[PDB]
Every structure is written in C-alpha cells, then in structure tokens.
C-alpha cells in the first residue's frame, strides 16, 4: 500500500495472509471456514494466517490454518486477467476474537465516488521497494467504469473495477494481491493488478466481487 497508514490491531480483523514459507498474497475471511483471494495467488499447500498485524513476529493472537480446498474460478483466464478470484476452504474453523472476524458479501454493487478501505502488507514505495512489518491501510474512491476503461483501454472487463487516484501517490501495490477492498461494510473488491503503483493516470484494478456472489454461495454450499 503506497501512501496509506498503519491500520492498527483489531481494525481489519477479516484480513488474512496467504503463506507457503513466505507471505505472498492477501485474502479476506468471509466466514469461519472460507477465505476469498485472487486466482493468480493460487499455490499448492497454502497456509492461511489470521490475527496477524506484524507479519514478522509471533504475536500469539495468531491462528495458522491450512487450506483443505483451494478453488480457482472455473473461467479464470490468465491471458486476460478476467475472473481473478479464488476460494479457499480452511481445514478447521477460525476461532473469532478481537483480531479475527469475517466480512460479509455485498448484496449490491458499489457506486462511483464511494470511499473504500484497501489493506495489505505490500510494497509502500512507488519507486523502489520497502515492505512493512505491520498491516497498512488506505481509503480510496471507486471510479466510474468509463474512466477505468480510459485509463486501461482494451483490458477492463465487466468483472473488474478501478479505485484510487488518477493523481497518483495513493494505491495498492506488489504484495497486496488477494486483499480486501471494503466499501459500506461489504467485501466489494479483491486486489488484482495495475500499471506500476501509485502512478499518475494508473489506478488500481480490482476484481468486482458483487458479480461473483452467486458463485461464492453455491461453491460454499456444495463443498
């Protein structure tokens, strides 16, 4: 997250970390046994970590739980980046506490101008690299689909939205992949891609979770 602030403990309880010896992606706890993340974060034997604020230290409030089933969206298309969503079923239920809670799914899509909370442990610099120890947070507005298409002509599908600032300075970045964009108390977005980080006219592109709710509910139901 470039140009954000330290979230604090307790402030983003639904944020999880996807791990396999190292942190590689964000994710959101949507109920006690199901995590959602990005399809491009798919890896064998993912361990989900919850209750982490500082990723580098064992705070004790953590819970480390393995994936039983990692389910990429069946139309996920690595050539186009479309359908960038994965569901992880945890092998055991997450016990809920001050630093672990679920975020619920939107009943409708979010509008342009709505202010969203985007969070992660990714790079905090637009030029060069600097990776934080604690979870960082950023408030960013949803942009109209027309301006998203203008920023990235050819690449924006119906299942993507843009959020952030065409000024630059404030954006998600490498390491934030899979993480939450939460608007009006609902999981509306998943950190996906962008041209650089926090560059002028180049906002974050996020998976549009509202289109996937019927798939998510069906997938959880049947598995």
């Amino acid at each position: 997250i470039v140009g954000g602030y330290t979230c604090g403990a307790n402030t983003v309880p639904y944020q999880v970390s996807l791990n396999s010896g190292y942190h590689f992606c964000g994710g959101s706890l949507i109920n006690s046994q199901w995590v959602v993340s990005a399809a491009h974060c798919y890896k064998s034997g993912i361990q989900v970590r919850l209750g982490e604020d500082n990723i580098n230290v064992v705070e004790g409030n953590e819970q480390f739980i393995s994936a039983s089933k990692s389910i990429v969206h069946p139309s996920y298309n690595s050539n186009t980046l479309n359908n960038d969503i994965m569901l992880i079923k945890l092998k055991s239920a997450a016990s809920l506490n001050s630093r672990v809670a679920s975020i619920s799914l939107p009943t409708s899509c979010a509008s342009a101008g709505t202010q969203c909370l985007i969070s992660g442990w990714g790079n905090t610099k637009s030029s060069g690299t600097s990776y934080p120890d604690v979870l960082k947070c950023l408030k960013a507005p949803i942009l109209s689909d027309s301006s998203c298409k203008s920023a990235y002509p050819g690449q924006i599908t119906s299942n993507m939205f843009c959020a952030g600032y065409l000024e630059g300075g404030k954006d998600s970045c490498q390491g934030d992949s899979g993480g939450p964009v939460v608007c009006s108390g609902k999981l509306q977005g998943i950190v996906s891609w962008g041209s650089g980080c926090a560059q002028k006219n180049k906002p974050g592109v996020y998976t549009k979770v509202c289109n996937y709710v019927s798939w998510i509910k069906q997938t959880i139901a049947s598995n």
């Binding site: 590689f24 990005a38 690595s78 998600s172 490498q174 934030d176 899979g178 891609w193």
Partner: protein, 163 residues
C-alpha cells in the same frame, strides 16, 4: 503454474530485484548489447563471450504479487525497475531473424514467460497471449550469440540474483 526460482532457492521477485541470466551450455558468456543491421547504437540482446556475468534483468508483471510464476506474462528489461528504457521485445531484422532487441516503451503485459527447461529455465515469446509460445535461442554471428526465436532449441539459463 510453478514459482520461478533463483540459484539460491528463492522465489524470483516481481520488479524488485535484478538477476543475471547465466547460460548452462555457454558458461563464459553473459548478456550484452550489440549492433545488428546498419544501426549506430547497439540494440540487439546478445550473449557476449567478452562479457560476464553480463547485464542483469528484472521480470515484471502488472499483477500485485511479489513473486513470478511460469504462467505470468512478463516484461523483461535491463536497467531499473520503474523505467521504460531497456525493455526487451522481438523484432524481425536481417541478418538475425526474429531478434530480441531493447526498446524505450513498456506494455502493461509483456510478451514473455519463463518456463522450466532441463536443468534451468528458458525465455519464451508469445506474439499474442492466447497462442502457443516460441522458444528464445541463439544465433551465432560476429563471434557472438544473438538471442532470437529458435523454437525447439531454447537457450537454458540459471537465474542468479545480482545480490
């Protein structure tokens, strides 16, 4: 699908670190630039025997993850990360053919992937993303090996972090 890995056993990062491409069957050569046709400035990417371990490269995806998998479409470039100079592309040019060259512009999605091959990796070029890929290999000319499409005969590399 699989994570791309350096000689020390670590995942290859997205943009943040530079890496030497060390050939397994041409150990004393390393990446450099050379002139091709009637061009004044050297813009062809070659493996130069007189240059080792050579110019390092970065691997860049627009995806907001800090590792590279073998399924990601990449830009490959010399020089610093955020820049648009030193960006690899493939260009039809005599006497080399489908030559790997450097340019000053960078698409959102680059045309290359790094794929496991034998005891290291090969660079693969995709003229369009939906299609099958063309291995990057070597064209011997002027006492140097120009990188070019040469499907069936990849140049196999270890990826060594510049540290």
């Amino acid at each position: 699908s699989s994570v791309v890995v350096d000689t020390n056993g670590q995942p290859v990062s997205n943009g943040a670190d530079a890496y030497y491409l060390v050939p397994v069957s041409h150990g004393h050569a390393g990446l450099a630039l050379a002139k091709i046709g009637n061009e004044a400035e050297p813009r062809a990417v070659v493996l130069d025997p007189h240059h080792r371990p050579g110019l390092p490269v970065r691997f860049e995806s627009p995806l907001r993850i800090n590792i590279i998998k073998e399924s990601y479409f990449l830009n490959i470039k010399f020089g610093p990360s955020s820049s648009d100079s030193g960006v690899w592309d493939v260009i039809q040019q005599d006497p080399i053919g489908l030559a790997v060259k450097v340019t000053d512009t960078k698409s959102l999605l680059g045309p290359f992937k790094v794929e496991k091959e034998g005891e290291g990796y090969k660079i693969v070029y995709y003229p369009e993303r939906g299609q099958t890929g063309l291995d990057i290999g070597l064209v011997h000319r002027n006492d140097k090996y120009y990188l070019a499409v040469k499907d069936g005969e990849p140049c196999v590399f270890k990826i060594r972090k510049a540290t």
